[PDB]
Amino acid sequence: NWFKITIPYGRKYDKAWLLSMIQSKCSVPFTPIEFHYENTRAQFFVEDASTASALKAVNYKILDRENRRISIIINSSAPPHTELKPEQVEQLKLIMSKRYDGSQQALDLKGLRSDPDLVAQNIDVVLNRRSCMAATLRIIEENIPELLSLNLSNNRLYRLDDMSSIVQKAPNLKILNLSGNELKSERELDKIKGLKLEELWLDGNSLCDTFRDQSTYISAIRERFPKLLRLDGHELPPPIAF
Numbered sequence: 001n002w003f004k005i006t007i008p009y010g011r012k013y014d015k016a017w018l019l020s021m022i023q024s025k026c027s028v029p030f031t032p033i034e035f036h037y038e039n040t041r042a043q044f045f046v047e048d049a050s051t052a053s054a055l056k057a058v059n060y061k062i063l064d065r066e067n068r069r070i071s072i073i074i075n076s077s078a079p080p081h082t083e084l085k086p087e088q089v090e091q092l093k094l095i096m097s098k099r100y101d102g103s104q105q106a107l108d109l110k111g112l113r114s115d116p117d118l119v120a121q122n123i124d125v126v127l128n129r130r131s132c133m134a135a136t137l138r139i140i141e142e143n144i145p146e147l148l149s150l151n152l153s154n155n156r157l158y159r160l161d162d163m164s165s166i167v168q169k170a171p172n173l174k175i176l177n178l179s180g181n182e183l184k185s186e187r188e189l190d191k192i193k194g195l196k197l198e199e200l201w202l203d204g205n206s207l208c209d210t211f212r213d214q215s216t217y218i219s220a221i222r223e224r225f226p227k228l229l230r231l232d233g234h235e236l237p238p239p240i241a242f
Contacts, residue, residue: 002033002045002080003052006073010042013064018042022072025058034080039087045080083131088123093139095125106149106175107140113155127155128182133162141169149175153201157181160191167194179232180204186220193224200225203232 010018019032033045046052052074062070084092095118099108112118112125126132140147147170157178166173176192179201186207200221202208211217222228222239229236 001049002047002077003049003055004075004077005032005044005046005052005055006075007042008071008073009040010070011037011040013042013070015042018070021062021070022055022058025061026054027057028054030055038085045077084135089135089139091118091121091123092125092135093143096136096139097143100144104149105144105147106151107144107147108151109136109155110151110177110180111154127152128158130162134165137163137165137169145170146172148172149177149199151177152181153177153204154180157183160188164191166192170195173197175199177201178205183207186210189221189224195225196227197225198227198229200228200231201233 030051035044056074059072060069118125173195174197176197183205
């Protein structure tokens, strides 16, 4: 089982110089495996743990041209050649800020694979993927926890178990647009029922065609969201109580 060695800022240094310095302080001979650059950082792999630990001891030991120390970060790992890069994520994070609105605390993520500035840099942003959605939601938690409205229409969403965590990341979310998607059953809603929504949009999804009468539809959903008030553009005949 493998380890991935990371030098933050390693692209800042001549490869030879860097590897030799490192070896110089390392207490064993080692060999870089599929050594590559990823943004400004240097990455390689290590076949065994004794080495890794030894590499690990070189942290803060090497000192650069500019009197800066050189960080070595060590992590257990799947073997080489095997998700989402930070420089990709930080671009995602960039685009969301763009489509974010502080005046109303509203994110807008409609048709996102089809975004110029993510397309323009070969970043497929595919929210129908568990890891891509997971990324989007950390970004939300980290940056705008007071998010209130969230448009997510036209993103071919098919399993909501991927936003299942949203109830904690976006506590006060109350407007959720899910129109123009690909959700088949109504059972999907059970994964996000904790949200005290006042607004909701579902049309365009094949679970709408489930219902014969719109008053069943509306009951089925208020089943999940009692406080619900608007839906698919329309006023809601107020809840009857018992």
